[PDB]
């Protein structure tokens, strides 16, 4: 028998005041006695039971397990999403809660990364909607008039009661260079409105990125490489590491976000640790910068050996 999750909390003062410590109870109704796991989640992160009390009661054939979480008055005012996760027989049962009105629904149009644009050959713009309340069909548009490639639609609900829309449209490479402008709008069953965000190639002059590759000296099966990409406008850039004619994973090397230089342009550093068996297979590690201002193929790279 599946269990029923239900969350309660401490009552506020008769004058509208909060108690010094807000406690959240997570009642589990009658269910067949078995393995029950009450994991408390704060914004999706695991809490330790060394702070929440677990109590189990079994009467006749039904079981009743309740967990109480102790929280301060300031943490309940943070509007964070608290979640009582209950797992039974394999299938999970989750009940979320938050502090407690109208508020605006916002959205942002994501620029396609130069990695998807110049390297992956699949430049994708992303129209992301946040803080939506319950078809939700999405529609794209181009300013030049040409029809858009059909974009994949993906709905995603969050623990904070919001619903998000993920739209991934494969765009053309020549269009983004010439200055094509894309827009996005959503018809929602909740509100009769439909907002719009727009993306395009970043305006202003352009500075080609300068790539520099260095290597730490050998000091008494592991070497550390560094790469400096600086003085480029705008900050839209993608950094990858090439080895054995194979692009290395992004989680392998540490790369910083673009930051303004002392003058004009941005600068990016990159750190990669290579093993001894790598440069023995091919002692050539290429730090390639993907920027729209680079020439000739929007690519400037340098090679380094150890």
């Amino acid at each position, epitope marked *: 028998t599946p269990p029923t999750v239900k969350i309660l909390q401490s009552s506020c003062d008769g004058g509208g005041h909060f108690p010094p410590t807000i406690q959240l109870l997570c009642l589990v109704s009658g269910y067949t006695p078995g393995t029950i796991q009450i994991t408390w989640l704060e914004d999706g992160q695991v809490m330790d039971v060394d702070l929440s009390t677990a109590s189990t009661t079994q009467e006749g054939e039904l079981a009743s397990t309740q967990s109480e979480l102790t929280l301060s008055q300031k943490h309940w005012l943070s509007d964070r999403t608290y979640t009582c996760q209950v797992t039974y027989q394999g299938h999970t049962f989750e009940d979320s809660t938050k502090k407690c009105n109208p508020r605006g629904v916002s959205a942002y149009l994501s620029r396609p990364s130069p990695f998807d644009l110049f390297i992956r050959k699949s430049p994708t713009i992303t129209c992301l909607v946040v803080d939506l309340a319950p078809t939700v069909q999405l*529609t794209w*548009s*181009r*300013a*030049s*008039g*040409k029809p858009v490639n059909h974009s994949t639609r993906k709905e995603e609900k969050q623990r904070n009661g919001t619903l998000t829309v993920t739209s991934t449209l494969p765009v053309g490479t020549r269009d983004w260079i010439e200055g094509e402008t894309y*827009q996005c*709008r959503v*018809t*929602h069953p909740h509100l*009769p*409105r*439909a907002l*719009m965000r727009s993306t395009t190639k970043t305006s202003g002059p352009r500075a080609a990125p300068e790539v520099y590759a260095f290597a730490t000296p050998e000091w008494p099966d592991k070497r550390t490489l560094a790469c400096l990409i600086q003085n480029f406008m705008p900050e839209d850039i993608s950094v990858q590491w090439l080895h054995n004619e194979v692009q290395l994973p992004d989680a392998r090397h540490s790369t910083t976000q673009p930051r303004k230089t002392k003058g004009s342009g941005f600068f990016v550093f990159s750190r990669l640790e290579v093993t001894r068996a790598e440069w023995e297979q091919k002692d050539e590690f290429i730090c390639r910068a993907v920027h729209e201002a680079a020439s000739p193929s929007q690519t400037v790279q340098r090679a380094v050996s150890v």
Partner: antibody
Amino acid sequence: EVQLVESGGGLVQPGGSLRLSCAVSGYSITSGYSWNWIRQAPGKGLEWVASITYDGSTNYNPSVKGRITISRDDSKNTFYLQMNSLRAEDTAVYYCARGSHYFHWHFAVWGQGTLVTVSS
Amino acid sequence: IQLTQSPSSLSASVGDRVTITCRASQSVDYDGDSYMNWYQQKPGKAPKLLIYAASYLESGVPSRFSGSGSGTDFTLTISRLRPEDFATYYCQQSHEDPYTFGQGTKVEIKR
């Protein structure tokens, strides 16, 4: 930047032909946006008459349909408008306009325009 | 579709609120998006586009303009009147071909 200039006006006999010209500089037409003509009568409002898309698809207005036609040239980087059987209502000031798409269009860049007098 | 602008002409002192109305005969919107634009026609030159979707402003257009409304009734509002922005403004729908324009609203500057 990109500007549009019209030409092809002057005194025209009634019932004759009017050949309009607007040169496009800065961008192409085959891979460009939408292009159309917008006229306004002396002291009156504006009335859309003829249009053409990047691929050449044309759409006209019924008030002067059957006696007007818009064409384009790939070598001159320009397009032309031809009108016939001009009645006193067709005497107007023709403007050159370029539009941009929205899911619904709207003219962003305009041309200087020309005045055509149709009388005896 | 025919548009009835309100009023046909107006005048106001420098730095006032300009309100223009335009009545549509049929619903020109769809899926919630307001489908109507506004233009600025100054004498001695060619007209210039103001905003689109009755609210979204283009680059190079003065921020003092503002549009509102939906469906059949639309409103154009200017934050403050400048001595160098006198012109006649028109409404225009784009839901069905052919496109039609309004009666025209002349905005006069006072001194």
